[PDB]
Amino acid sequence: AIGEFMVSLPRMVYPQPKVLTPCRKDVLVVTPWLAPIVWEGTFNIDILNEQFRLQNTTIGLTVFAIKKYVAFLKLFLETAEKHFMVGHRVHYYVFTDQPAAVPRVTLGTGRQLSVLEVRAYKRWQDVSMRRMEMISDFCERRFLSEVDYLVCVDVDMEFRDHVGVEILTPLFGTLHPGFYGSSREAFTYERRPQSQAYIPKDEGDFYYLGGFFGGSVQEVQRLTRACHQAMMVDQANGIEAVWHDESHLNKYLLRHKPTKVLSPEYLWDQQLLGWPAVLRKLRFTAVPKNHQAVRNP
Amino acid sequence: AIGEFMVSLPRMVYPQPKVLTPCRKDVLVVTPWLAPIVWEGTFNIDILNEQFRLQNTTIGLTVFAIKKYVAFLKLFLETAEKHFMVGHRVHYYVFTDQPAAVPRVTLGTGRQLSVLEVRAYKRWQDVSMRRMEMISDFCERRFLSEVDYLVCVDVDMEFRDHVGVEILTPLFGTLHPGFYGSSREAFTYERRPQSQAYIPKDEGDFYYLGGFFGGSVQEVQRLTRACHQAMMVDQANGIEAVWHDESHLNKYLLRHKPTKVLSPEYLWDQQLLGWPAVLRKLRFTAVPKNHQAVRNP
Numbered sequence: 001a002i003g004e005f006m007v008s009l010p011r012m013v014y015p016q017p018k019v020l021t022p023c024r025k026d027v028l029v030v031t032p033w034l035a036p037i038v039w040e041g042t043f044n045i046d047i048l049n050e051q052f053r054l055q056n057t058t059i060g061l062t063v064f065a066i067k068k069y070v071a072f073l074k075l076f077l078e079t080a081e082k083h084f085m086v087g088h089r090v091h092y093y094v095f096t097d098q099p100a101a102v103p104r105v106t107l108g109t110g111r112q113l114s115v116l117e118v119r120a121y122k123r124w125q126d127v128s129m130r131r132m133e134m135i136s137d138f139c140e141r142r143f144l145s146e147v148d149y150l151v152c153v154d155v156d157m158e159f160r161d162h163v164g165v166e167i168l169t170p171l172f173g174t175l176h177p178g179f180y181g182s183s184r185e186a187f188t189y190e191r192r193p194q195s196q197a198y199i200p201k202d203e204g205d206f207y208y209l210g211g212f213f214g215g216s217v218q219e220v221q222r223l224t225r226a227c228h229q230a231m232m233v234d235q236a237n238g239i240e241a242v243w244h245d246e247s248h249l250n251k252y253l254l255r256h257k258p259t260k261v262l263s264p265e266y267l268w269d270q271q272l273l274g275w276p277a278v279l280r281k282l283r284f285t286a287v288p289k290n291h292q293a294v295r296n297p
Numbered sequence: 298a299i300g301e302f303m304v305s306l307p308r309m310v311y312p313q314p315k316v317l318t319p320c321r322k323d324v325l326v327v328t329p330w331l332a333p334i335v336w337e338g339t340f341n342i343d344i345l346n347e348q349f350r351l352q353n354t355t356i357g358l359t360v361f362a363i364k365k366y367v368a369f370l371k372l373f374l375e376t377a378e379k380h381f382m383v384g385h386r387v388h389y390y391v392f393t394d395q396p397a398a399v400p401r402v403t404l405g406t407g408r409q410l411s412v413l414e415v416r417a418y419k420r421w422q423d424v425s426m427r428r429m430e431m432i433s434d435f436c437e438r439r440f441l442s443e444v445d446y447l448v449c450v451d452v453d454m455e456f457r458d459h460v461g462v463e464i465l466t467p468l469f470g471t472l473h474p475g476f477y478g479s480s481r482e483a484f485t486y487e488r489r490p491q492s493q494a495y496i497p498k499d500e501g502d503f504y505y506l507g508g509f510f511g512g513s514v515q516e517v518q519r520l521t522r523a524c525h526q527a528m529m530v531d532q533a534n535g536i537e538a539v540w541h542d543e544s545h546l547n548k549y550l551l552r553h554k555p556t557k558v559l560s561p562e563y564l565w566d567q568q569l570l571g572w573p574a575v576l577r578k579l580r581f582t583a584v585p586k587n588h589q590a591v592r593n594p
């Protein structure tokens with residue numbers, strides 16, 4: 001449940017937060033609209049686990065495995081079992097054009113998996129973009145009755161470390177690992193005024209990822225419906241945003257500020273970007289792929 | 298309104314938040330349960346004003362002026378007009394045993410004041426404590442229909458600088474200016490196990506003030522009802538907590554973590570504590586008083 005009566009926390013023994021000692025002095029840990037930016041060291045997971053278990057929180061995790069990307073599911077799901085919301089109720093929703101190719105992964109107690117068959121688009125861009133329509137369609141029925149929060153991620157990934165209830169909030173995005181140190185004029189937002197995703201060079205807070213966002217079911221429904229509608233407008237006008245669904249997600253999160261922002265710990269590419277000092281953990285990471293080969297027949 | 302459909306923010310030009318630059322390196326700006334700690338420099342008030350004006354937010358401010366404390370109202374209200382939620386809808390609720398002693402203060406547009414007559418208790422401790430009952434009684438009727446948030450403060454105070462929508466959240470407390478640098482064993486929590494306010498020496502996050510707390514009407518109703526009920530249990534058992542309503546508020550906020558914490562900028566005593574470097578602003582400050590004289594006939 002979200003927003004129900006909250007029972008008292010039990011007695012807990014943990015280190016006192018000290019007002020005159022920051023958790024992290026090397027990074028921004030709160031946005032200018034007072035949303036936490038989630039980095040290792042900023043949260044006590046024991047307190048958060050208590051809060052969320054006392055609400056019997058259920059988390060849905062959506063992942064698309066269309067065409068050749070079914071090959072990524074086994075590692076994705078097996079590592080999710082090790083690191084994603086362990087001890088909490090989890091419902092995986094695997095969207096695929098090949099139900100028979102979904103691997104048989106052994107799940108911990110209180111965790112379930114549903115396979116949702118969908119159509120495969122020819123263009124990888126359309127496969128990526130149509131996730132917004134598909135997620136919004138499934139919010140309207142299944143998700144509202146079955147989960148409290150939705151977490152929507154790419155499949156070409158593996159969990160390596162804890163991804164837990166610290167991320168949960170009405171609406172979150174994740175800082176793209178390529179651009180967290182960049183100035184806004186360098187962000188690869190859509191820059192053509194003819195697109196609904198357009199952001200001028202003097203606007204923007206952060207560059208968020210298309211591959212890891214989420215929130216309450218209500219807020220995820222809103223985001224995905226808005227991005228789908230914006231994409232349909234662009235299609236009618238003969239324009240496709242430079243980075244597809246990610247461009248639209250960035251426009252949405254500029255105008256509807258997220259209530260938490262995840263640091264790049266939560267989506268990293270170690271082959272491309274290494275392991276900087278500012279990252280104490282690499283939690284969820286890119287699996288190397290040959291883009292041209294895996295995206296086409 | 299709270300939790301209604303949120304329209305898009307307009308285009309705004311403001312400084313980009315930089316991920317590799319903290320707003321404040323000298324203080325903790327987020328709690329271990331991912332609640333912001335509100336200090337100058339951590340928020341862009343223009344973004345926040347937009348968010349809250351787009352929801353047509355109404356803020357109630359409760360203040361008790363019982364017996365001789367009616368003398369503090371003129372300065373309290375006149376300075377509130379200069380600094381408290383300016384541009385937002387405000388409803389002041391002045392609880393008093395002397396309606397005719399409430400000064401005629403000129404209010405800005407969109408602001409109103411209601412005088413609520415209540416009984417005066419003999420003991421200043423009981424006057425302070427019974428605010429919980431009185432606030433919870435008035436939540437049940439007036440406040441739920443009239444305001445979105447409640448802010449509950451002491452009267453023996455003046456505003457000197459901005460106190461605005463940065464504070465608004467489901468539930469907040471304020472760091473006591475005497476103890477923000479103290480270790481938890483030094484906090485003046487109730488230490489007798491016989492009291493409902495009891496907190497052991499190895500528990501506690503912060504020492505919060507009885508004089509400045511608030512939140513949504515629902516959460517303030519919960520807090521005030523719980524503290525009143527706990528006080529009634531103590532009374533039946535022949536014990537009065539060491540710091541009265543403040544002791545109970547501290548117990549409640551230990552077990553029900555606030556969703557924002559206000560820094561001591563928001564309740565300061567300059568005569569007792571000066572103006573430390575860590576305080577960039579003194580927003581709401583103690584008016585000097587002779588405690589013995591003003592609390593008794």
Ligand SMILES: O=c1ccn([C@@H]2O[C@H](COP(=O)(O)OP(=O)(O)O)[C@@H](O)[C@H]2O)c(=O)[nH]1
Binds near residue numbers: 066068156
């Ligand atoms: O043929 C495809 C292309 C894309 N995707 C899905 O769309 C996501 C985004 O595409 P991709 O991971 O290639 O984008 P990148 O991370 O490289 O930006 C993938 O993770 C898959 O979940 C898919 O299932 N099959």
Ligand SMILES: O=c1ccn([C@@H]2O[C@H](COP(=O)(O)OP(=O)(O)O)[C@@H](O)[C@H]2O)c(=O)[nH]1
Binds near residue numbers: 361363364365451591
């Ligand atoms: O005779 C009294 C005693 C207390 N109060 C109210 O109770 C609050 C708390 O008391 P006080 O300010 O004396 O406490 P302190 O700040 O000194 O702890 C005051 O601000 C008033 O709002 C009052 O109205 N009349």
Ligand SMILES: [Mn+2]
Binds near residue numbers: 154155211
């Ligand atoms: Mn990917």
Ligand SMILES: [Mn+2]
Binds near residue numbers: 452453508
């Ligand atoms: Mn006072």
